[PDB]
């Protein structure tokens, strides 16, 4: 007779509890690194939020690809446990060495003089791409912070959570991991703010952000060591399933042949279309919103404190949306649920763009509501991003990992692997390539606002007319089998 606590088997609590706590610690570091990497590249002197479009395509896109080939080559010469110590520990070493060594010694290694010479000979519209060379070590931090969410979150954990949880355990407790992932946004958001508030202790030239940064990178090491400690616990005290070698000798189906499969199957092309549209449009709004953020919070510490507040608000909103997701679904349907994220993104983004653009002959509201137009833009963009992401993880991702079900477990297993590592970087990089062309054609990101709103309609229109193309293929396969 197996014992039970809280209506759940004790034997499966030793697996799920350290797994959700480890997912908590992973999203705790992620919520700290993702706020920090925006502080570094945007609030750096000589750098603005226009470095983001060029970081996504020219810097971290080749590094993310180059990381996926190093990981793929290491996935054959290392064991499963050795793989989750060679890909997780250099991250902990890097961020610990950054806040304590690399960042302090950054006015020693950043070519501020050469970047200024390049800035004059090229023009004012090149501050974006040139800042990549100006603060290159901050750009390397940006890549590693991106690679945390791309590898530690998406690859390392879910690759380990899927190899140890039963198919029915992965169906009941995975919705609870996302719930606990946003508790790691409320807390780490409060953590980021607490360590971002400038200590009343002033310095002659003491960087208030240097002491603030290493107070965060210490927790990243501290929580990163908990991930390695929890992972070691679950791999020695938890009896894992004995699923044999028989998983179709997993042939990760290259890249070119991968999107060849994409176009071949009409069911996967639309899903990839949704996954890239969310990733183009979110960037199209978010980079301009971060430009406004830089305008409102020039200091690194004020920007970081706002990032912590924003992370806490995002966590609360996403927790509420995950709670009401399995009422929206059950009431309205997959087709309705797949439309809100495009719709919320479109509406919030166009409201934010029409407050930036048509903010001139509309300002009694922002005036009597106790704000400046810049602060109003900051708050509207923050609400845009909060609603878009709380819809993402509560309606879009549920729709994505619900549309896989009616597919055959060969097409499903290959297509699901093809979606993540391709479409997520592909969407996040195309949405930035668009903005690179915008910046280098119209000069600044603010001169690109009328068009950034118009590509937003085009991407969302193809995003809306791809779920309907899938609401009718999801319904077809899920009804005929009945």
């Amino acid at each position, epitope marked *: 007779a197996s014992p039970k606590i809280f209506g759940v088997e004790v034997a499966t609590l030793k697996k799920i509890i350290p797994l959700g706590l480890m997912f908590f610690c992973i999203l705790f570091n992620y919520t700290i690194l993702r706020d920090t990497k925006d502080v570094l590249v945007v609030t750096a002197k*000589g750098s603005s939020a*226009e470095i983001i479009p060029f970081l996504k395509t020219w810097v971290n896109l080749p590094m993310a690809i180059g990381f996926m080939l190093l990981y793929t080559k290491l996935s054959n010469v290392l064991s499963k446990k050795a793989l989750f110590y060679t890909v997780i520990v250099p991250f902990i070493i890097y961020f610990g060495a950054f806040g304590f060594v690399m960042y302090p010694l950054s006015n020693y290694i950043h070519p501020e003089a050469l970047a200024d010479k390049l800035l004059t000979t090229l*023009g004012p*519209r090149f*501050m974006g791409p040139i800042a990549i060379l100006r603060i290159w070590s901050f750009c390397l931090f940006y890549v590693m912070a991106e690679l945390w969410g791309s590898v530690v979150v998406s690859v390392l954990f879910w690759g380990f959570a899927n190899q140890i949880t039963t198919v029915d355990e992965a169906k009941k407790f995975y919705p609870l991991f996302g719930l606990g992932a946003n508790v790691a946004l409320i807390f780490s958001g409060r953590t980021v703010k607490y360590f971002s508030n400038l200590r009343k202790n002033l310095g002659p030239g003491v960087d208030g952000w240097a002491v603030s940064l290493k107070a965060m990178m210490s927790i990243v090491v501290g929580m990163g060591l908990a991930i390695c400690l929890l992972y070691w616990w679950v791999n020695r005290y938890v009896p894992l399933p004995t699923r044999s070698k028989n998983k179709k000798e997993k042939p990760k189906m290259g890249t070119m042949e991968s999107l060849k499969f994409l176009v071949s199957s009409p069911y996967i092309r639309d899903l990839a279309t949704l996954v890239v549209a969310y990733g183009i449009s979110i960037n199209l709004v978010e980079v301009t919103w971060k430009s406004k953020l830089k305008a409102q919070f*020039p200091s690194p510490n004020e920007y970081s404190a706002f990032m912590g507040d924003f992370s806490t608000c995002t966590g609360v909103a996403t927790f509420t949306m995950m709670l009401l997701s399995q009422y929206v679904f059950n009431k309205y349907g997959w087709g309705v649920a797949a439309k809100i994220t495009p719709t919320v993104l479109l509406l919030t983004g166009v409201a934010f763009f029409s407050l930036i653009l048509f903010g001139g002959p509309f300002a009694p509201l922002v005036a009597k509501l106790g704000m400046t137009p810049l602060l109003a833009a900051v708050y509207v963009g923050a609400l845009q991003n909060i609603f878009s992401k709380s819809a993402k993880y509560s309606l879009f991702d549920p729709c994505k990992e619900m549309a896989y079900i009616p597919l055959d477990e060969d097409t499903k297993v290959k297509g699901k692997a093809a979606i993540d590592v391709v479409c997520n970087p592909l969407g996040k990089s195309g949405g930035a390539l668009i903005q690179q062309f915008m910046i280098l054609s119209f000069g600044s990101l*603010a001169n690109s606002t009328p068009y950034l709103g118009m590509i937003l309609l085009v991407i969302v229109t193809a995003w809306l007319a791809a779920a309907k193309s899938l609401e009718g293929q999801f319904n077809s396969l899920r009804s005929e089998e009945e």
Partner: nanobody
Amino acid sequence: EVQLVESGGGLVQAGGSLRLSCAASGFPVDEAYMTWYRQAPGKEREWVAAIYSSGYTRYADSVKGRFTISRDNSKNTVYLQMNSLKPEDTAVYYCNVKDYVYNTYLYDYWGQGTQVTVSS
């Protein structure tokens, strides 16, 4: 139409301070790349300081630490805070807004300049 009007110039003693204003009309100063020049008689026009739309500031080696360029977004005015003024700083200071890609100058608007003379 773009218009740059400088003010705040005058006669000050060596080691004094002076603040030049540049009331911009026809474009927002926050999205512009604005620069300060100076030209003494006999010598060619010399670039002094430059501010970017990002708020990034550059200064010539002759005025680093002493001069500070800044803009007020409400009044649409850039400022040149000249501190520890030397007699070598005596020149006509020009407010300039321009945009260019390499050697193609898309626009280049100058002000009429203000006379800054430092006595001794």
